[PDB]
Design a protein around this ligand. Sequence first.
Ligand SMILES: Nc1ncnc2c1ncn2[C@@H]1O[C@H](COP(=O)(O)OP(=O)(O)OP(=O)(O)O)[C@@H](O)[C@H]1O
Ligand SMILES: Nc1ncnc2c1ncn2[C@@H]1O[C@H](COP(=O)(O)OP(=O)(O)OP(=O)(O)O)[C@@H](O)[C@H]1O
Ligand SMILES: [Mg+2]
Ligand SMILES: [Mg+2]
Ligand SMILES: [Zn+2]
Lengths: 208, 432, 173, 633, 189
Amino acid sequence: MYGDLGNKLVLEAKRTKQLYARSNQDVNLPMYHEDIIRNILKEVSNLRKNTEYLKEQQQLGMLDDKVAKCQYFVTLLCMERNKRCLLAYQRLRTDILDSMAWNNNGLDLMSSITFSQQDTNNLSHQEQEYLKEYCDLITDLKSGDLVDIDLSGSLVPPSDVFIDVRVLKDAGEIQTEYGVFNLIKDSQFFVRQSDVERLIQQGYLQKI
Amino acid sequence: DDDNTEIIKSFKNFILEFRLDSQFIYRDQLRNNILVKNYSLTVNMEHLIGYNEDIYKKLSDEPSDIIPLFETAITQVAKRISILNSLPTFQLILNSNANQIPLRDLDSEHVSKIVRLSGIIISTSVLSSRATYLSIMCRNCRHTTSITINNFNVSLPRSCLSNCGPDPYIIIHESSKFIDQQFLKLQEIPELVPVGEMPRNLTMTCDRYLTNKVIPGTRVTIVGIYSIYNSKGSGVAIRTPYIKILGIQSDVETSSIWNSVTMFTEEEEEEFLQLSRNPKLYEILTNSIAPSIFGNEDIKKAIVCLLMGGSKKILPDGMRLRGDINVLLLGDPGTAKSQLLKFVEKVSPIAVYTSGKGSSAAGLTASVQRDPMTREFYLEGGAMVLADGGVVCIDEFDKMRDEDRVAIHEAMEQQTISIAKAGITTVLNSRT
Amino acid sequence: MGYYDIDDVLADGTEFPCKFQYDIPGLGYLENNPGRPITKNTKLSLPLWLARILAIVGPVPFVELLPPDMFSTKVMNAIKTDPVALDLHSINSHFFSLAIKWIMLFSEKELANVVSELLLQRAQELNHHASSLSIDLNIATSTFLLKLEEMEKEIYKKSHESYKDTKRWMFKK
Amino acid sequence: DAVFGDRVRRFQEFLDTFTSYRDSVRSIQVYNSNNAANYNDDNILPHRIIISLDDLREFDRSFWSGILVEPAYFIPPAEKALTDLADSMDDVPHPNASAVSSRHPWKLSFKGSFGAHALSPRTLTAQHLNKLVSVEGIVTKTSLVRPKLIRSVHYAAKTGRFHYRDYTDATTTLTTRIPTPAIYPTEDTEGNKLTTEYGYSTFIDHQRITVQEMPEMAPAGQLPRSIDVILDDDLVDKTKPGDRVNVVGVFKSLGAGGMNQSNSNTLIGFKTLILGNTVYPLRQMLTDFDIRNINKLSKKKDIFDILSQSLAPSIYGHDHIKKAILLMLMGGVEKNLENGSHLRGDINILMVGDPSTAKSQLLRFVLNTASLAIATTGRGSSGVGLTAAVTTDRETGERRLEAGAMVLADRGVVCIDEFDKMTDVDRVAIHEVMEQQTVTIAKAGIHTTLNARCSVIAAANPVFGQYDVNRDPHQNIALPDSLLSRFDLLFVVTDDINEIRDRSISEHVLRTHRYLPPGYLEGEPVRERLNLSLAVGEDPKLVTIPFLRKYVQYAKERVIPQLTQEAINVIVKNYTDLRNDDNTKKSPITARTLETLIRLATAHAKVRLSKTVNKVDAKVAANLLRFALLGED
Amino acid sequence: SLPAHLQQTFSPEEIQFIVENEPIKIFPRITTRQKITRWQLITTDDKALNNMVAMRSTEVVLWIALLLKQQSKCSIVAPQWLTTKELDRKIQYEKTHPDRFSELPWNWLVLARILFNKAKDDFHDPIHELRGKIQDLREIRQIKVLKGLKYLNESHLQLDNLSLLEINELRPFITEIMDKLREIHTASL
DNA sequence: TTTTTTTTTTTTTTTTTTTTTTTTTT
DNA sequence: AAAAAAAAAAAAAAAAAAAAAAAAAA
Ligand SMILES: Nc1ncnc2c1ncn2[C@@H]1O[C@H](COP(=O)(O)OP(=O)(O)OP(=O)(O)O)[C@@H](O)[C@H]1O
Ligand SMILES: Nc1ncnc2c1ncn2[C@@H]1O[C@H](COP(=O)(O)OP(=O)(O)OP(=O)(O)O)[C@@H](O)[C@H]1O
Ligand SMILES: [Mg+2]
Ligand SMILES: [Mg+2]
Ligand SMILES: [Zn+2]
C-alpha cells in the first residue's frame, strides 16, 4: 500500500539496466525522477508523523501495548522498504555515471570538451557534483605511482604493430613524437598503432 | 544402383567440402538445424552451379528421380555429424534466381521441369496424412513385411511373398509412420492477365515443413515442379496439371496462425528502435503517405493513426472494448478520395479493397455453401473475414444497397459475425 | 541477500495469502478500508516484505502464512509430467526466487527435489537454443523464449553473447 | 506372449498397491448385485473406472510412458488385469439365464496431467497418431445410435450343442486383425443346419460425434476446424450439439489410404479418427459452506438491490433494466392446465433506444453469465436456421432433423440483436415460438413437434435514427402489434444531454479504460494466446459472479412459491388502477398485464428464497411495470 | 575490466594474447651472430635472438616470430601435431573412446587459426585437408560435450582434457547452473 | 414520376465403394 | 474344376444465393 509507489521507481531502474545491458555503444541516462522521489519523501514524512502520533497516544496510556506494536512495526517496515527502493535506484544511476567517467580518459567531462554522449540536464545537481569529484579522483590517481602506465588507456590487447587508418573529421597539422601528421579529410594513413590510439579514441580516425 | 551410389557420394561430398572463405556453411547449417529439431536443409542453386556444373545438370533434367538421392545424402551426413536413431528423412528446400514464368505461359513444353512463378493464394485446405513406412501382413500365411515410400510421384504388392489370394495384404496401422500434406490454390497477378480474359487458377501441393506457411490473399513466390496426374472431361488421354512446391517466399512475415512473436533479427530491431527515437518521426510518417498527392495533411495524419491503431482491453466481467479506428470521407469529386484508398491497400500488411456497388451482405460477412461430394453445408469467408487484423476500404459507400450496408453494424463495433443458417449456428471473429 | 539487486527487490514485492490470528484496531488500509478496523480470522493478500516479518513476531505470531496458489499439487504434477513444455512465465515471472525463499522459511525437502530437476531439465533446452547461431547464405526458438523465467533470460543472454563472440573471432577475415 | 503376461502382472501389482480402485470395484459390484435382488423395485452402473495417470507416474515410469506414447500395446494388457481382479472379487454366483454368454468386460478411463498431449482440433497433426490425446471443443453434429454385432450364437439340431462366432472391426479394437464379413454361419462342421438364437448374442451401441474448435481461439482470417470422435457402449448420448466438451482418447488411422488397387492420385490420403475413452463437460455442485452462505445472504433486507447491481459492473446506470434481467434469470413457475395447455413461465424483454446506449453490451453479458444462452443477429439468420433443418445421416443413411437456434436453447435464453432489421419471412417463425413454445415440422415425410421453451431478450432501434417524442409510439417502432404484444417488458431508453451526467459517465468510462490485468506490465500487449497451455490438470458491497451463478441455480432448482390471496388483492388493485387512467403509455394495457404481474411477483418471491408470494413481491412487480410502461420512476 | 562484461570471463582476444605468449620454433633467414644494437628484452630471454645463424633451428616466443614473418626474415615450422597422419590418429582415438577427450594441446584451435592466417606457405600438407580435419575433430568434441552436460550437480565436475577456447565458451552457463543448484540445495539444509 | 418495394425462378445429379454375386477362360 | 476379370448398387434434395422482371407508392 504505502510502498506500492516505490515499486514503480524500481521498475524504471530495470528498464535503464536493459539500456545499459543492450548497449553496443555508450548511451545516455534518461530523465531524473524527482517527482516520484518527492512523492516517496512525502509519504515517508507522513509515516514519521504517524509514528510520532502513535508515540504520544501510547504515552498517555489509552491503548494497549500489543496493539501499538503492530502499527509501529508496519510503519517501520514501510519506511525501510522505501529506503531500499531509493537506494537501489541511486546506486544503479551512480554505477552508470562511474562507468562513463572512466570511459572518457579521465578529464573533467561536461566542463571541458565531451564526446556528446550525455546531455547536461538529465543528471541531478548532486549527481553533477558527484561526477566532478569522481573525475578529480581519477585525475589524481593517474598522477600517482603509476605514471608510466596510462590507467585510462585502451583495454583491448595489442596484436597488430602496423595498421591502416582513415580520417573522419578535418583538422590541422599535429606534432607527434619525432614527426608530424597532416589530417586532411578523406585521406588514408599507414602508421604504427601506438601513435593513433589517442586520435581514434577521440573520433578523428577510423578503422584499426 | 551403380549410378545412385555415385550420385549420393557426389551429394555428400558437396555437403562436406563446400567452403567460402573460412567456414563450411552447409555443414554448420545442418548442425544448427538439428539442435532446434529442424530436420531440413536449404540450398542455394548458385552455390551448386559454382561447385560443379554436372551435378546441377543432373538435377535440372530429372528432378523427381534425383531429389530423393540428395534427400538421403543429407540424412547420411546428419547421422555422421550428430551421432557417434530417431532421425527421419530430411527435407530439401531450394532457392532460385531464374526468370519468373507467368501462369498462362505454362504449357506442355514445361512438363517435368523446375519452374519459378508468382501468384496470389486464394484458399488453403486442411492437413491430410500420407504414409512413409508401411507395416504389412498377409491374410493367410501371416508374416511381417515393410515398405518405404517417398512422396515424389506405388501400391501394395499384387502377389504373395514368403494358396493365398490374388493380392492378399493388409496394413498394420500401428507402427506405421505418416507425414503432413496440404493443398493450395493459386491465381495470377491482376496486372498480368491478358486483355479480355478472366484470371485463372492452379493447384499446388506442399509437404512436411512447408505446410501452414501462407494465408489467403498473400502474394508469394513459388519454386516447384510442373507435373501431371491422370485421374477422372470427355477428352481422350487428357491429364490435369499441378505443381509440387519446393520453396516458398512470402511478403507477409505472418505464418498461418500469426504466432504474434517476433520474426525480426536484431539487425532490424536496432534499426526500428533507432527510427522510433527520431524527434520528427510523426512528420516523416505523415510525408510518406501518398507523396504524389498535394495537401490534405489532416487526412494523412488520420490514415497514420488508423494504420497504427489503438489498444484493446478485456475486463473481469467479460466486457470487450474495441481498439480499432474507422474513418469516413464524404466530399466533392476530384479531391483524391479514391487515390488514398488504394494507397492504404498497398501500405497495409493485410488489406482488402472493395466497391459498394458490386457487393452483397453474404460476400462481405460470410457465406454458406454446399459441397458437391459430401453434400453438406459449410461456411466460407468474405471481405471482412479475409481482412482480419487489417483494413477494409469500401469505395462508393453511398451507392450500397440498404440491405447490404446494415450487415456491417455488428462487425464494426462488436467485431463478431453471427451465423444461424442451415443447422450451423456459430460466431466468428473479425477485428478489422 | 542482495540489498541492491533489482530483481530481488521486485520478486520480494509479490503478494502471498495470509490470515490474521489476533483482533486489532487501527489497521484497515491493508484492506483499503481506512476507518474499518480489522477483525480476527481475516484472510488477506499481503506483500512478501511484510508477511515474512509479521509471521515471526508474536508464542503464536500475529499472522499465519497460508499455502500459496503457485505451489499447489496441480503445479507440481505439471512440473513432474513435462518440464520443458510447461509455461513458467504464466505461473509467475519470479518462480525460482520465490521457490528458494519458500524453501528457506519452511524447510521443505520435497520442493527442493522438484525444483532442482526442473532446472536441470530446462538447462539442456536453454543450451540447445543458445548454441544455435544462424548462418546467412525457427518457430521453436520464438516459442521457447516466451516460456522463460526472469532468471533464465539472463543466462540465455550470457550464453548467446559468449557463443556469438567466439564464432565471430573464429571466422574473422 | 511373454510381454503381454509381464504387463498384466505389472498392472496387477499396481492394482493392489493402491486400494482405492479395489474398493470402487466392490462398491459397483455390490450395488449391481443387491439392486437385482429388490423384487419390489422403486439403474445399472457400467463397468468402468477412472484411474489417475499421476499415481501411475510415481508407481512405474515405464508403464506410464508406454500408456502415453504407445497406448495400443499397454491398454489391452491393463484391461485384462482389471477384468481378472473384478472376477476375483465377485464371490457370489450369478447363474443367470443368458449373462453367462456376455461377460461385459471392464474398461478404463484416465485423468490427471497430460503434459504436451493436451491439444485442440487444429494443433493435431500426423505426429500424434497412435497416441493418447485429449481434445477440447464444441459438439456440432451427432449421429443416430445404432446396435453393432460382436458375437453370434447358433444352435445345432440333432446334436443339441451351441456354436459361437466372434466379430471384430477397426473401430472396435485397438489392434488390427483379419476382418470379418458379418455373415451368420448356416452350416455346421458336419453339415447340420444351424439356427441363429437371438437373446444370447452380443450387441453394443455405437455413435459418432463431431467436435469443433472454439471459434474464439482461431487464428486471424481462418475458420475453425473440426474432428470426429467415435463413442461406444456406455459413452452413448452423454453429449448434445452445442455443448463444450473435452474428450480423451486414442488418435488412430484407418482404411487403405489410396495405396491400393485404385488409381494413383495425389488427392487421396488416410482417414483419422479418435476412439474416445472419456468425456468431461468443461451444473456447479454446491457444498454446505456455499449453501450456508446463500441462506445467510438471503435474510438481508436489501438483497434484491445488491443482486441486481452486481450485474455488469462496467455499465453506468440502467438500474431498472438490470433488475429486469435478474428477474429473467429466475423465471416464473409454469402451470400445466387442462385442454393440453401451459401458461408460460418465461419473461421476455425488448429494449428500444438511441444509438450508443449500451443495449448490445447487456446481451453479451447475459450470454456469459447465464447457464444456457444462444446469440442471434437479425440480418444473418433464417427461418430454417432458427427452428430446424432437414439433413442426412452419412453413417447410417436415413434422413433426419438438425436442431436450430430456438430449439437448442430449451430451458435457456436467446439474445437477438438488430431485431427490427430481420426480414418478414424470418419474423413469422419467431412469432410461433413466442406463442406456442413449440415448432411444427411437416417436411420431407418428417412430421414432428419440437419443444422450445426459451426466454427472449431483444434490442432494436426506432424507425428513424433517434427516438422522437413529438410522434406517436407506434410510428417510432416498425415492429407489428402482434409481435409487440408478446413481450412482457418494453424499455424505451433515451440519451439526454446534461452536464452532470456527462461529467459522471465520462469519469466512469475513463476509469474503466485504465485497467491492467494482474501479471502484465505497463505497455505490454495482452497475450490472449495461452501459449498452447490449455489446462494444467485434466479433470456498499458487491458479490462475485460465480456466487451469483450458484445463487441463481439454487433458487431455480430448490424453491417453487405459490400465490396467496393478500398478494392477489394488491395485484388486482394495481391492474384496475392502471387500466382506467388517461395517461398516455408507450404501450397499450390489456388483460395480459395481470399475467405479467403474477410472473414478476413469482420471480421476486424466488429471489427471496421463500415458498409463498408476499405483498412486497406485488409492490416490486408493480413498481417495475409502472416504470416500464409510464416512466414515472 | 568493467565495461563490456569482462567481470569474470576472458574475451577471445585475451585468449589469443595468452596463446601468443608461448614459444615456437623458427628457421632464421638472417645471421646476427656477434662479431669476433642488441635486443636486451625484459620479459623474454634474448640469448637465442642475439645469437642467430642462418639455416639453423632456434626457438623464440610466438609474437616475435609473427613480427619477423611480417618481414622476410623468418619461417615458422608448424608443430608436429599439425599433420594429416597425426590428426587421423587423434580422430580414430576420438572415435574409439566415447567417454574421454583426446590429448590435444591446450591451444590447438587458436594456434591452428593463427598459423593458417599468417604462415600459409610453411605447411607441407595441403591446407584445405588440414582445415577439414580440424572441423572433423571439433564436431566430435562438441558431441561429447553435449552428452557430458547432462551430468551436472552441486558437488564437482571433471573435464580432463578440454581445450582453453572450449572451456571459455562454456564457462558462464556451467558456473551459473551449478551455482543455482547449490543455492537450492543449501536452502533446504 | 422515379423512386422505392415485391414475387420468383432455375440453380440441383458425374459420382463410390469394397464385398457379394455372376460370366468367361486357362 | 479352377483362376481372373467386371461390373451392379447409387439416390436426392432441401436450403441458400444472385438477378430480372411485373406491381406498389413520396
Ligand atoms: N490533390 C491532388 N493531388 C494530386 N492529384 C490529384 C489531387 N486531387 C485530385 N487528383 C487527381 O485527380 C484524378 C481523379 O481523382 P480521384 O479518382 O481520386 O477522385 P475522387 O475523389 O475519388 O472522385 P469521385 O468523388 O468522383 O469518386 C486522379 O488522377 C488524381 O491523381
Ligand atoms: N452507460 C454506459 N456505460 C458504459 N459504456 C457505455 C455506456 N453507454 C454506452 N457505452 C459504450 O458505448 C459503446 C457502444 O455501446 P453499444 O455497442 O452497447 O451500443 P448500442 O446501443 O448497441 O448501439 P447501436 O444502436 O449502434 O447498435 C461501447 O464502447 C460501450 O462501452
Ligand atoms: Mg472515386
Ligand atoms: Mg448494437
Ligand atoms: Zn500369403
